[PDB]
From a paper:
Our model heterodimeric ABC exporter, BmrCD, is presumed to be associated with drug efflux in the Gram-positive bacterium Bacillus subtilis. Incorporated in giant unilamellar vesicles, BmrCD can transport ethidium bromide in vitro, a process powered by ATP and inhibited by orthovanadate.
The cryo-EM maps displayed anisotropy in both OC and IF conformations. Heterogeneous refinement implemented in CryoSPARC42 was helpful in resolving the anisotropy problem of the maps for the IF and OC structures.
Author numbering:
A (entry chain C): 2 to 347, 353 to 434, 451 to 461, 465 to 469, 476 to 572
B (entry chain D): 1 to 564, 567 to 665
The structure:
């Protein structure tokens, strides 16, 4: 529970490899205390009279088998405990972007894409590192410390141990204090380097102006100043950084010297042997890692608590409507009737219009007036407003999402292509000629890509085809030919043409001119001629 | 060209710091390594000195130990040598220590039955009496050494503190060295970037160049830190430790020296496999990021199509391979790293035990546990940095390629050599003569563009896209060379002067007002450092309303803390800069495809202020706000289709009529 379960669900279903790993790790922890004591015993047996070839052969055999045992147990348990990290990384990626897809864009695409892309790498790495490395540090800093402490407090002495151990708490606290400031002074270097990067980018984008007014030497003078500041920050950080190795060297040599001097003193009182001295020194040698492991543990367990709160907020707290409501549904979308719709973005005010099966309709208007809000709501990507959008008679919400999106064939004004080849963008229109032109090559000409979007939307063979300013890039003749061809092919199918040009969105079936926050009128092309002075055929030869 | 050669040539600079660091590190390593040698002496000569023969002597007082009877003195501590005198020993059996008051002819297996110590070793040299050393007696035989125990200890202590300083300094010094080299590097790079043809930045994005300036030089910084703080330090620590081992013992030193080939083969194969296993995760994570980014801004389209659930397919096709190679890297780590370190460490314990037992107690003697302890400490020190060594050796290649990139940038010879400004106002008499400019090869873009703009300003260049309107600006500032024809200013060939001189006559107000981050006053001045009060005057003359809102634009006012405000105010600042710099010739590469409402009105109010009293080139496409131009020129096909006044083209119809007919 709390910080335990927050990651524990991962190996709650994987307890086998996250418990065998712990067991093998503790077995290695205990077994690793043998080689030093065996070496000390070999020394003491050499010193005494009793020593034969059998003891030597026995000692080399036991050392070999202990080596092989530790080598296999590590190669297996650490393999499991880091394959677990790999699997947790793979799980967190999958779950994060699965939430991404199974969502809508009303308030999420509002949220900065920078945060969303930074999560999926930074925080995934942070949490996976928690699970693996933080657990390893916990094991080697809560037990390995206590195990070695007691191995030297029961098998060597309870006097030499405390003496040779007193400096290590000081070492750990000094390491923590140094880390408390190196990070504080690392922000300075990183952000000054960022400022130099910003200035270099600003000087490299505006090269034409810089060289136009012959200021490049000033620029070089400005670039050198910032480089000097970056160097100065790096020095203010290296000053502290160079205090790490000296302090560990000092407080490990002090440990070794206390051990050796006090051990010789005790031996002079016949409380140890020499083999015990060698074994205790080997123990001191093997006790270095936990002192850094404790710091790594605390760092990771302090970082993860927030680096996982982030993922939790961008994975679970998100509660929006991306799914439909009641089984209620209309198998056929032929007719579309609006009723007092007041859709708003996360716009419309008392809008009402009608469409019918096999009706090529067009909509136009001015700028700043709801024109995308009409079809955008029909795509179910933003919260619904007042009124009703019924395909036959019932509210919009009951319409299923899968069937709805399958019916719509949409071409967006802000066109976007994903697949790297046009063939896959169409497997996802007058382009038979574009094939015999400059470009199935690759994606990522605006008009050509709009044509690709048109072909892709048409390939659905849909029943409600929405075109949103999809003909503003091509010529008037080209768009006229496109609309004529689609109307002839899709004679018995509905269309919702939308474009700034008031030529292909009036005479098809009807024009719903939108002005301000309400409708100007619901007439047709012929009625549009006799109406308020507006963008009529005067502005188009 | 070799990367290493230039890296060494760059390191030779700031060589004083490098030599100081190397020598400080060498002395610190020696001082530290001398510690385990002190421990060996302090064990063998003091703790294990009791084994040496003892002689009956109350003469050398203050160091002659007292048994229950007469007092004794060590062999080598015999200040008044008496030669044989009375031979005595203190032997060790199990835990007990036994005093033998008689000469012994052999050493070997020691057995005690009833106070009669027996040493035979298969020879039965003799049977000797013995007396248990009790507890106080054993301590009395240990007191003479206590002083030495303390003394050497202090020595150890001393050196430690000493080494600490000699360990700090060097590292710090190394840091400076590397950093300073990078600084040098960066400077040179940037200098060479200011000698680069505009083609360089035309055929390359800004991100690439900035990365080649800063991020690559940071990679080179890390390369220098890797080479110095890891390879040099590790090599020095290996040389010192091996020397100490060779001083201690030879054959065991030959065994220890037999590990360098082991590290060589370990590193070779680890790199050979880690190259695979790390390239094939860096590339795959790049693919992962590309897929995730290409499928997030299309949340409105991916949702409304048949791919909200098909992305998973090809992704996981990539992701399973990513995780598979992650696990392969984990396997390679498992068969190496700390694991092989511990395997070798246990093999070293085995080597120590085998050698000592088989060569010392097979002959029943010549055992030095001080040498054992020193070897143990030395090999513990040795086996620390192997993992870092192999890791850095594997990592070196990316730094190698980044350094190669920066060297290629620093090395190419196609650069522009100039820097000389002018000393007069040209009066804007720019002339052209059958310029035939070709961009890549053979595909000419300008066809004998010949004309002569007089001091009368506003020679507007309004024409067709893909014609050469921007080529005119590029050749005017010599951003490119025409490769034919000629261009002149007051009869002076453009291709026989200096670029800085040429651009010192002409300014520009580009369609995209560059608002360099900082203060507005410096922005308009472009940090000139040669105008003090004219900037505010030439700004207020046209944008006098803007300061009325908040503070003073020259007075470090900061509406430009986001790389700016209103686009009109953005183009107005550009105009103010162009006026303050006050060139003779003036080019307006104005491209307003989407005019921002009526804000352009004041913009026109600004243009008339600046265009006057100059030789202005207005590369516009409105053909309505420039109806007072002294010479309209229309450009299509790369050749001057038509030229004339604002009215002389209306009479002749032509391309100008065609465009102005789309009024
Ligand atoms: C000494 C004190 C006195 C009390 C002693 C009481 C016993 C103390 C024992 C303590 C040991 C630790 C127990 C851990 C919790 C058990 C459940 C568990 O581990 O789940 C595991 C499987 O489920 C099992 O392992 C059940 C095993 C026992 C019941 C099955 C019959 C075997 C009887 C054996 C004979 C002995 C018992 C005979 C009983 C008549 C894994 O499931 P999960 O992955 O976690 O899925 C749920 C969570 N999730 C959905 C998020 C994934
Ligand atoms: C025992 C009573 C209860 C406390 C329990 C503490 C438990 C934790 C134990 C102790 C571990 C440390 C815990 C606190 C950490 C605070 C942040 C920090 O890193 O400060 C560090 C420095 O901070 C400064 O230097 C601030 C400047 C003012 C202080 C004076 C510094 C110069 C002292 C020298 C002046 C020169 C003359 C000498
Ligand atoms: C990454 C490291 C360099 C990789 C390329 C090395 C190369 O091309 O060969 C160089 C190896 O390398 C050297 O001998 C020079 C590299 C070290 C330069 C000194 C660094 C500071 C100490 C050849 O160097 P050389 O001096 O021509 O022999
Ligand atoms: C208190 C303790 C004080 C200690 C002394 C403090 C001294 C003052 C501190 C800073 C050093 C200042 C050096 C100034 C150099 C001036 C230029 C010159 O002519 O000299 C030449 C030096 O080498 C020779 O003079 C030998 C003759 C040239 C043969 C080619 C070099 C052979 C390298 C073998 C020489 C031994 C190699 C040693 C390797 C570790 C320059 O040769 P280089 O090729 O251009 O660069 C070599 C750089 N290196 C020497 C670092 C490799
Ligand atoms: C060196 C550079 C390479 C040389 C290559 C030589 C070329 C090859 C060799 C060629 C040989 C000739 C044939 C040709 C006692 O026995 O004497 C010893 C000192 O003894 C004392 O120091 C007594 C006084 C104690 C002082 C305090 C402890 C000093 C510890 C000092 C700790 C050792 C410090 C030095 C070793 C790290 C002398 O031996 P050692 O010094 O103890 O060893
Ligand atoms: C006192 C009364 C007894 C006189 C005994 C005189 C024997 C003096 C021999 C001292 C050892 C030889 C080397 C000395 C240097 C004093 C012991 C060293 C003090 C530690 C600090 C100096 C360690 C060296 C630090 C690195 C320079
Ligand atoms: C041998 C190791 C000596 C350790 C010394 C290691 C070197 C210490 C450098 C300074 C510490 C880092 C820092 O604060 O950055 C500022 C670096 O730039 C400066 O301001 C230069 C240093 C100024 C102080 C005086 C000289 C260095 C200390 C000279 C002290 C006397 C040295 C006597 C040597 C026998
Ligand atoms: C490098 C060191 C240089 C080594 C060179 C030493 C001289 C040549 C040795 C030849 C050995 C050889 O292979 O020939 C052998 C014949 O073939 C059969 O194997 C005296 C040398 C040691 C002291 C060096 C001090 C260096 C101080 C600095 C160190 C710095 C080191 C780190 C930089 C010779 O006979 P053997 O060897 O007796 O044969 C095996 C015997 N065995 C079966 C019992 C095992
Ligand atoms: N993504 C959006 N989020 C919030 N409000 C929006 C969004 N897109 C448009 N609006 C607002 O919708 C109101 C109605 O006009 P809208 O901008 O939707 O259509 P339009 O610009 O006339 O049409 P088109 O997008 O086809 O050019 C405008 O005031 C605009 O502020
Ligand atoms: N970086 C370049 N490398 C090669 N050719 C180029 C480059 N930039 C432009 N050109 C070529 O220069 C010729 C004219 O381009 P220019 O930019 O001068 O046109 P423009 O008349 O200003 O057009 P626009 O209406 O887009 O402003 C065309 O052949 C174009 O392909």
């Amino acid at each position: 529970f709390s910080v335990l379960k927050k990651l524990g669900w991962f190996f709650k279903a994987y307890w086998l490899r996250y418990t065998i790993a712990i067991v093998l790790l503790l077995a290695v922890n205990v077994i690793e205390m043998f080689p030093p004591k065996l070496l000390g015993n070999a020394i003491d047996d050499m010193k005494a009279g009793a020593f034969t070839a059998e003891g030597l052969l026995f000692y080399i055999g036991i050392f070999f088998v202990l080596t092989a045992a530790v080598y296999i147990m590590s190669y297996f348990w650490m393999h499991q405990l880091f394959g677990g990290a790999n699997l947790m990384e793979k799980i967190l990626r999958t779950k994060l972007m699965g939430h991404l897809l199974t969502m809508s864009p009303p308030f999420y695409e509002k949220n900065r894409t920078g945060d969303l892309m930074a999560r999926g790498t930074n925080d995934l790495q942070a949490v996976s590192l928690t699970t693996g490395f933080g657990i390893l540090t916990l094991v080697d800093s809560t037990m390995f410390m206590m195990t070695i402490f007691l191995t030297m407090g029961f098998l060597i002495s309870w006097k030499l141990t405390f003496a040779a151990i007193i400096p290590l708490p000081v070492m750990a606290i000094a390491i923590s204090l140094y880390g408390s400031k190196i990070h504080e002074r690392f922000t300075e270097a990183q952000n000054a380097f960022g400022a130099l990067n910003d200035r270099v980018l600003e000087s490299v984008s505006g090269v034409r102006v810089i060289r136009a007014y012959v200021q490049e030497t000033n620029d070089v003078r400005r670039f050198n100043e910032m480089t000097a500041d970056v160097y100065q920050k790096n020095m203010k950080v290296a000053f502290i950084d160079s205090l790490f190795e000296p302090t560990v060297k000092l407080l490990v040599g002090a440990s070794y010297l206390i051990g050796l001097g006090y051990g010789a003193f005790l031996v002079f009182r016949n409380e140890l042997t020499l083999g015990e001295l060698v074994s205790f020194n080997v123990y001191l040698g093997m006790m270095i890692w936990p002192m850094f492991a404790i710091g790594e543990l605390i760092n990771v367990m302090q970082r993860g608590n927030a680096s996982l709160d982030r993922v939790n907020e961008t994975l679970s707290y998100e509660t929006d409507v991306t799914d439909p409501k009641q089984p209620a549904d209309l198998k056929e979308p032929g007719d579309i009737v609006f009723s007092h719709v007041s859709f708003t973005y996360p716009n419309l005010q008392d809008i009402s219009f009608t469409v019918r099966k096999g009706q090529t309709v067009g909509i136009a208007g001015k700028t700043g007036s709801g024109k995308t809000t009409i079809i955008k709501q029909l795509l179910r990507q933003y919260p619904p407003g007042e009124g009703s959008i019924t395909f036959s008679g019932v509210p919009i919400q009951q319409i299923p999402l899968d069937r709805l999106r399958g019916w719509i064939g949409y071409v967006p004004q802000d066109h976007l292509l994903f697949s790297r080849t046009v063939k896959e963008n169409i497997l996802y229109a007058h382009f038979e000629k574009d094939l015999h032109m400059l470009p199935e090559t690759m994606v990522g000409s605006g008009g050509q890509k709009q044509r690709i979007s048109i072909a892709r939307a048409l390939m659905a063979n849909p029943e409600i085809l929405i075109l949103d300013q999809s003909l503003s890039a091509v010529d008037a003749k080209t768009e006229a030919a496109i609309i004529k061809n689609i109307r002839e092919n899709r004679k018995g199918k509905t269309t919702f043409i939308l474009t700034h040009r008031l030529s292909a969105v009036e005479h098809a079936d009807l024009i719903l001119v939108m002005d301000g926050g309400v409708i100007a009128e619901r007439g047709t092309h012929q009625e549009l001629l006799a109406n308020n002075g507006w963008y009529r055929e005067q502005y188009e030869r | 060209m070799k990367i290493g050669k230039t890296l060494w040539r760059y390191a030779l600079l700031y060589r004083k710091l490098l030599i100081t660091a190397v020598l400080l590190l060498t002395v610190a390593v020696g001082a530290e390594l001398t510690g385990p040698f002190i421990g060996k002496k302090m064990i063998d000569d003091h703790i294990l000195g009791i084994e040496k023969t003892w002689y009956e002597a109350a003469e050398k007082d203050k160091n002659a130990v007292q048994f229950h009877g007469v007092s004794y003195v060590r062999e080598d501590r015999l200040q008044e040598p008496v030669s044989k005198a009375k031979e005595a020993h203190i032997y060790q059996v199990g835990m007990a220590f036994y005093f033998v008051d008689q000469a012994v002819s052999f050493d070997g297996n020691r057995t005690v039955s009833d106070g009669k110590l027996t040493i035979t070793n298969g020879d039965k040299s003799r049977a000797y009496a013995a007396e248990k050393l009790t507890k106080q007696e054993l301590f009395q035989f240990y007191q003479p050494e206590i002083k030495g125990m303390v003394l050497l200890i202090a020595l150890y202590g001393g050196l430690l503190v000493f080494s600490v300083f000699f360990q700090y300094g060097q590292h710090y010094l190394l840091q400076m060295s590397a950093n300073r080299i990078i600084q040098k590097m960066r400077q040179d790079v940037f200098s060479h970037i200011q000698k680069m043809p505009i083609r360089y930045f035309d055929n390359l994005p800004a991100g690439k160049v900035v990365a080649r300036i800063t991020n690559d030089t940071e990679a080179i910084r890390d390369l220098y830190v890797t080479v110095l703080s890891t390879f040099v330090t590790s090599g020095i620590y290996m040389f010192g430790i091996f020397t100490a081992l060779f001083l201690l013992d030879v054959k065991l030193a030959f065994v220890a020296l037999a590990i360098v080939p082991i590290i060589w083969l370990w590193s070779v194969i680890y790199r050979r496999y880690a190259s695979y296993y790390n390239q094939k995760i860096r590339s795959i994570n790049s693919d992962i990021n590309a897929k995730m980014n290409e499928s997030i801004q299309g949340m409105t389209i991916i949702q409304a199509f048949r791919h909200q659930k098909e992305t998973m397919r090809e992704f996981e096709e990539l992701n399973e391979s990513h995780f598979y190679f992650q696990n392969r890297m984990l396997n390679l780590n498992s068969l190496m790293s700390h694991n092989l370190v511990n395997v070798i460490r246990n093999l070293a314990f085995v080597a120590l035990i085998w050698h000592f037992g088989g060569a010392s107690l097979n002959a029943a003697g010549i055992v030095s546990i001080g040498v054992l302890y020193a070897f143990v400490d030395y090999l513990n020190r040795l086996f620390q940095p192997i993992t870092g060594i192999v890791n850095q050796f594997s990592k070196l290649e990316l730094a190698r390629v980044s350094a190669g990139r920066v060297f290629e940038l620093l090395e190419e010879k196609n650069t522009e050599e100039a820097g000389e400004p002018a000393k007069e106002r040209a009066l804007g008499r720019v002339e052209f003569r059958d310029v035939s400019f070709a961009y890549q090869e053979g595909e000419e873009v300008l066809k004998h563009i010949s004309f002569t703009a007089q001091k009368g300003e506003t020679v507007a260049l309004v024409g067709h896209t893909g014609s050469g309107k921007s080529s005119i600006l590029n050749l005017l500032f010599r951003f490119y060379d025409a490769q034919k024809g000629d261009v002149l200013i007051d009869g002076k060939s453009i291709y026989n002067m200096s670029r800085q001189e040429l651009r010192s006559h002409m300014g520009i107000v580009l369609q995209d007002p560059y608002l360099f981050s900082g203060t507005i006053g410096s922005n308009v001045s472009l940090d000139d450092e040669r105008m003090t009060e004219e900037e505010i005057k030439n700004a207020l003359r046209q944008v006098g309303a803007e300061p009325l809102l908040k503070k003073l634009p020259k007075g470090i006012n900061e509406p430009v803390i986001e790389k700016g405000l209103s686009s009109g105010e953005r183009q107005l600042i550009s105009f103010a800069r162009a006026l303050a710099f006050d060139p003779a010739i003036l080019i307006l590469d104005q491209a307003t495809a989407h005019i921002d409402t009526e804000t352009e009105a004041v913009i026109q109010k600004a243009l008339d202020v600046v265009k006057q009293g100059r030789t202005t080139f207005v590369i516009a496409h409105r053909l309505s706000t420039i109806r007072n131009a002294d010479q309209i020129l229309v450009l299509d096909k790369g050749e001057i289709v038509e030229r004339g006044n604002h009215e002389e083209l209306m009479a002749l119809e032509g391309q100008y009529y065609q465009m102005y007919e789309l009024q």
